[PDB]
């Protein structure tokens, strides 16, 4: 009844890639780079932790809205479901990767303002 759900905050590594299926349905893909931060004891200020890079998918109107509104570097908040997709290596094997099927996404207002236009 419950999918595995997630919230990620981070920046897009690149402009959202927008495609259209053969039916005309829009799909946008992008990756969120999430930079955590540790205390870094033994003197010293903060220290950025290893970044997590999550590939995200989103469909139809929401995908179009993402393509119209976000770009490389955009700081975003994303909620969605973690899904495992299967791929194919040039050596025959099927290696999986975890991606986010996005439910909702928006630009963070932490360091930015936004002019919102409702559909």
């Amino acid at each position: 009844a419950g999918d595995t759900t997630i919230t990620v905050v981070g920046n897009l590594t690149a402009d959202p890639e927008l495609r259209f299926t053969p039916s005309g349905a829009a799909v946008a893909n992008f990756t969120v780079a999430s930079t955590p931060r540790m205390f870094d004891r033994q003197s010293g200020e903060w220290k950025d932790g290893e970044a997590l890079f999550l590939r995200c998918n989103i469909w139809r109107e929401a995908a179009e809205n993402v393509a119209e509104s976000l770009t490389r570097g955009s700081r975003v908040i994303v909620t969605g479901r973690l899904k495992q997709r299967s791929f194919e290596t040039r050596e025959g094997e099927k290696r999986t990767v975890v991606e986010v099927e996005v439910d909702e996404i928006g630009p963070s207002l932490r360091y930015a303002t936004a002019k919102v236009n409702k559909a």
Copy 2:
């Protein structure tokens, strides 16, 4: 050890921006989350939210009554123990953004 929460919903009213006596910007708003499954609204959940600093000012400039938002933060609770027991909750907002589910946005850094 902090209990975190993500809520999606609509501002019940325009964010109220103030400044502490110290000069620090603070914004208060309430998120109304009404689940649906175009048939049958669920119970409506109204979460009081507070946020600070530049984010506070960006919220006040960018969002209004009705704006659909994604909010993540820490869930807080108070009890006013009394004459009579009263509790409220509140979310100390870490990040907030307008949802692009049903809208577009022109974004402007800094």
Copy 3:
């Protein structure tokens, strides 16, 4: 569209097991979540929880006052609008288990 929450904390009291007039088992318990960072407790957050069916009976059999638990469920809110405004929250528990952070458990299916 449902707002979910995960909370980690300790039962304030032994779970209270009842049966609806229908015969359905229900358990009520409250989770006290006290964040720490062995220096400085944070604010304590007490979430009323309800769960149903076999899970209700397993909770009542397995957990007591003090038991450290991991709880995920849907956050619910009520307003008692009145003579005077009063709200409470509650978590409709999807799953619950005792944490193995500071304890072991002998587990027994069914």
Copy 4:
């Protein structure tokens, strides 16, 4: 300040693998198989969705407690942080995978009871 956090519910695919670092610190690894469920419209009851398999890591006392308490098939609830680890293929390349650094874990009481013993 915020890591990317997650809650997963599922079953262990196998008994937890327990190891000890050269310092004597315990580490347990295991994978949670999370089976979501869709409505399956166009007549028909429920239908299990594609399972998500997440590799989980946990350390020290908590790892020992997991090894003492859980086995293959154990239904569990897990909270933790999503981390990307780097590996090495037999063809030279470094392929990453997302894992859970476990904060807390416990056996679900959904279909089971537990005798809890506090340390």
